[PDB]
Design a protein around this ligand. Structure first.
Ligand SMILES: C[C@@](O)(C(F)F)[C@H](NC(=O)c1ccc(C#Cc2ccc(CN3CCOCC3)cc2)cc1)C(=O)NO
Ligand SMILES: [Cl-]
Ligand SMILES: [Zn+2]
Length: 269
């Protein structure tokens, strides 16, 4: 496909899931070859794995003393829409969580795409690779299309669930919300996270029950959201990705580990 930016500036705002603070975004058009980058307090922070500074419960980026928390959801939306050149100006410390899914970003950006004049240079997985960490694993292999499978094993009524995204089915994952388990809430707050989480932006589950009165959007909403997360972390390769991925219980740390191994393989090709 063609490289793409946005036609006009787009703004979003609201509380961040981990800081609990209100922040504002402005998405700016950029010319061919710019890449995806954040901008904060006069500093550009490229959306690339070299700038990852935190991977526990979110993926955070930083450069020259300026940090942005929770980039995975906006990056996933930009990856799915193959937006390749854009500056995300952040006034605040975190990307807004909005309703917990990518939907509001996706719908607004999708109607505001500007095609540009050169083709995308995709990051094309060239050979199989496996990374592992204490029973979690992620595999990748070549594919002409982006295909991403997540398999989870939940310690509550959800049990084992599996979901596969393929190109063309973007609407199946951009509405899946972030989620949390009630028995983990106290620890997440103690380690300084989750300050913005509420039933308005998080699917909260117990051992046997659903806290949200509206219930789940899909019976497998959590693994759909985990696929959505992984697609955002994969965009830290710096280009839209072609390959077939399978994650068993992976999280941001393992996602970024895979990204860094893939980037090392193609550093000069
Ligand atoms: C899903 C992830 O873990 C992923 F990493 F796997 C991760 N999400 C996260 O890491 C993550 C972590 C925590 C929260 C939260 C919360 C919260 C929600 C409501 C209340 C309110 N109470 C609920 C009970 O009744 C009384 C009221 C408290 C706290 C959300 C999200 C991801 O999406 N990263 O991109
Ligand atoms: Cl490769
Ligand atoms: Zn997420």
């Amino acid at each position: 496909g063609l490289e793409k930016t946005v036609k006009e500036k787009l703004s979003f705002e609201g509380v961040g899931i981990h800081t609990g603070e209100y922040s504002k975004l402005i998405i700016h058009p950029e010319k061919e070859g710019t890449g995806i980058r954040f901008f904060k307090n006069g500093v550009y922070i490229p959306a690339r794995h070299e700038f990852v500074v935190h991977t526990n419960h979110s993926t955070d980026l930083g450069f020259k003393g300026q940090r942005i928390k929770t980039v995975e959801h906006i990056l996933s939306v930009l990856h799915l829409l193959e937006i390749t050149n854009v500056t995300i100006e952040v006034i605040g410390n975190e990307i807004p969580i909005l309703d917990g899914s990518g939907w509001e970003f996706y719908e607004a950006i999708r109607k505001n795409i500007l095609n540009q004049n050169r083709e995308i240079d995709y990051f094309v997985v060239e050979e199989p690779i496996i990374v592992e960490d204490e029973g979690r694993l992620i595999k990748a292999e070549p594919s002409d299309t982006l295909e991403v499978t997540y398999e989870g094993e939940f310690k509550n009524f959800l049990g084992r669930q599996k979901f596969t995204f393929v190109e063309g089915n973007e609407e199946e994952i951009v509405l899946a919300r972030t989620f949390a388990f009630d028995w983990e809430i106290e620890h997440i707050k103690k380690v300084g996270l989750g300050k913005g989480g509420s039933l308005k932006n998080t699917l909260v589950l117990g051992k046997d029950k659903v806290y949200n009165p509206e219930g789940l959007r899909y019976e497998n909403e959590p693994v759909r959201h985990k696929v959505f997360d992984l697609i955002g972390d994969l965009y830290l390769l710096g280009s839209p990705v072609k390959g077939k991925f399978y994650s068993f219980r992976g999280g941001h740390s393992l996602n970024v580990k895979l990204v860094k191994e893939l980037a090392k393989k193609q550093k000069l090709t």
